[model samples]
Target: MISGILASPGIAFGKALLLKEDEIVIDRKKISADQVDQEVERFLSGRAKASAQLETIKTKAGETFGEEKEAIFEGHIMLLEDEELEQEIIALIKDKHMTADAAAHEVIEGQASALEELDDEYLKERAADVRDIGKRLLRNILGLKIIDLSAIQDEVILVAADLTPSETAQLNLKKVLGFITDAGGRTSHTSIMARSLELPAIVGTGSVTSQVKNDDYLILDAVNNQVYVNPTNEVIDKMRAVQEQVASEKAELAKLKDR
Candidate 1:
């Protein structure tokens, strides 16, 4: 039996497991505290001087790319501004008697939980962003590393904030038809890449990670902001029709939009 794997960009933690009929068969036995530490380190690897390094990158890119293109980097800037997260990790160290690395993990997971519980969709979306960037930072601090996707053999439906141009460029566009994410405005880079690549995509689905599993088959309704998991045949047929209609309309619009 084949398993499915999904990855969010900028997320350094990789999870894998097999799905039984009704239960999830986890291989978390291979997941060690050391491995977790490594993952954290990878995300936060440049911590000592990361701010300066990042600022350098920002300056060069801002000048090179201009405001329109450079603005995408604001997400990284937001990650650096997370004073609440920093304080939370400090609390974990002082109160929970956890290691600095463990405290970092606690902060990431704790923030994610807080964000997921919010009643507002916009707030929930912010949670996804927090989780995505939090994982990256923690990995760097812990000197961690993660496995590559190609190393795993599975079909996938990746969902996340907007994919950077580099990420979209590296992906095997042909194999990806399903895309549901919690980030990106309608005009974000990932959205443009989805259109350019003709991949079925749905963005701004806040905290959608909680609703899906690595095993679930995904259906993305780009025409509508809907994501279906293990959808029934009736729903699948309806969405497929919608996909075709949207494709045709998009093609028609492309012919005259610029002229």
Candidate 2:
């Protein structure tokens, strides 16, 4: 059994859907003093677009995954709307005399770096969330298309090196059985959203990305904190038994809550 950080609680038995990582290119250059206002306007426009996209995702998430799951995007929306971050990026453009892309890169990377230094694993994972939002901002500034997560055609556990909050927000809930990541921790945006959606998840598996390939049989057991890759019949049977027991327990707990 492979060990990993138990991100969200549940059992997942399915073929793995590996998400190949794509490279994001950011262009950085110097800007003239007269272009500062124009750069700031570009950033603001990007932020507005990001907000609208998120609102659409939020509404869809609520209708598809329940309102509780939709609440995860609320945090994402607030992040985009944060005036402090906007001001910081604008300041960097004006004072540092950097291009909008360069300023956003510096500001967002700085925030992510500081988060990584924190002792809290959860908080450290927030660094990924920051970067995710930063990437969205940069894409907006650069007129790049955001990666869409709604394209999966089967119900499979999603395995990725890392997933951004916006990417996580667009997941086809009906087609995603769970999520696994080679990087990130319990506090990462992907992890938090998994919990919010009540989907089973495990993170920080380190090399699960290279070890497993697309469509490989996988078992994600959050209860025991193990990931079984192409397990034998015995192991699958054991996991199924455990899965049934967990579902029974959850049903009983729900009854208790209703009472």
Candidate 3:
């Protein structure tokens, strides 16, 4: 069994969906003093659009899941609306004459770096959230299309190097059986989202992305904190038996709690 951090607890079996990393390369275009206002305006406009989009996601999440899950998006909204972050990006444009996208990348990366360096596990995970909002804003400014996770038609186990909070939020929970990542921790917001969705998850595998392929059958046993990739028939049978036993135990526990 492949070992990993148990981000969420459960059992799941499905074909893999390899979620590769998408890179964003910003082209730094210099702006004249006269055009600084225009650049800042462009940044503000992008934030407005991002805000609207976030509201939509928040509303949908609330309706589908509940208010508790929707609160995650609320946190995202606050991050986007953070005056300090907004001021830094605007200053970069006004002072350094940088393009909106370039200014945003510099400032946001710096912010993410600071968060990552904090001596708290919870704060470290928020670093990923900063990058997630930064990416969303950059996409809006750069006129790039966001990757829509809701388009996947079949249920699968998502395998990724890492998942940003935004990427994790937009997932079509109905079609996602579980997910595994090469890097992350139990304290990550992405992991918390998986738990909220009741999705089985393992993170910090360190090599899962390189080891697993798209459409490869895999099993995530969060209770045992193990991931089985392309297991032999014997292993599969044994795991399945374990899953059944766990379910029976859970059912009995629920009955006792009900009483």
Candidate 4:
């Protein structure tokens, strides 16, 4: 059995669907002075694209979870569109002769680091939000393909190294039974969002991604923080027996939220 921290509590049985984030490696190659305008234009175009995507996501999140989630997306979009951040990035490209990709990465990372160093819990959460926007901007600037999570059509448990709040907002719980990740903790966006959605999630399991693959049957008991791969019938029966309790708990959760 694989053990992990309980992000959200419940039992889940399903096949695994691995989500791989392609690592983006941008070299800090300085550009020529004459190329500065080109780099600036590139960054501006990417900024616009990221803004449009976030706007769409904000609307979709409202439809999915309610206005609370949409508010988060709205905040994220504002961060992306912050004039201060955009100006800093452009200055790096125009004055320091840096590549747009590397400049944006450095600026965004610096901003996120500043926020993360603070003591406020809510502000610390915004650090992740900053980094999420960074990834989106970087991907757009680099012309990389962004995985469309909402396009998933089958029922399975998602396994990933991590899931940012931006990605979490796009999930369709009907097809996603639960999720496990190699990285994240109780206060992480993925973990908190899982609880908000009442979805089973086991996170901070360092080896889960490498060990599990697509179509591998998984039995995740988030309440107990245990995972069984292709469990025996006896174990399945034990887990099945507890489903009623899970249902009742969700019922309580819904009513509690309803009123």
What TM-score should be assigned to candidate 1?
A: 0.40
TM-score of candidate 3 versus the correct structure, residues matched by position? 0.78
Residue-level error in angstroms, candidate 3, position 169: 2.9
Query: Can you give the TM-score per candidate against the true fold?
Result: 0.40, 0.67, 0.78, 0.86
lDDT of 3 by residue, 152-178 (tens): 988778788887655665677778777
Models ranked on lDDT: 4, 3, 2, 1
The sequence of per-residue lDDT tens digits that candidate 1 reaches over residues 1-259 is 1112222221111221222122212122233344455534433445545565445555544554456545655555656656765566655545554555455656677667887899876567566656655555544454445333323354556655345332343445445545555655544556655554455555666666666566556554433334455667787677577656756765776599566
Local error of candidate 1 at residue 165 (angstroms): 10
Better of 3 and 4 by lDDT: 4
Candidate 1: RMSD to truth: 10.8
Better by TM-score, candidate 3 or 2: 3
lDDT, model 2: 0.75
Write candidate 2's Cα lDDT for 1-259 as tens digits. 6788887777767898877644668656676888788877887777778788767877875776577756766776786677888788778888889877888888777888998899886577667667777776666777866556697677777888876655665667678777788755634566666666777777878898889998899877788788878889986787578668879878877787667
Comparing 2 with 4 on lDDT, the higher-scoring candidate is: 4
TM-score of 4: 0.86
Q: Write down the lDDT of every candidate, Cα atoms only.
A: 0.50, 0.75, 0.77, 0.80
lDDT of 1: 0.50
Worst 10 residues of 2 by lDDT: 183-192
Residue 138, model 1: Cα distance from true site in angstroms: 3.3
- Which candidate achieves the best TM-score against the true structure? 4
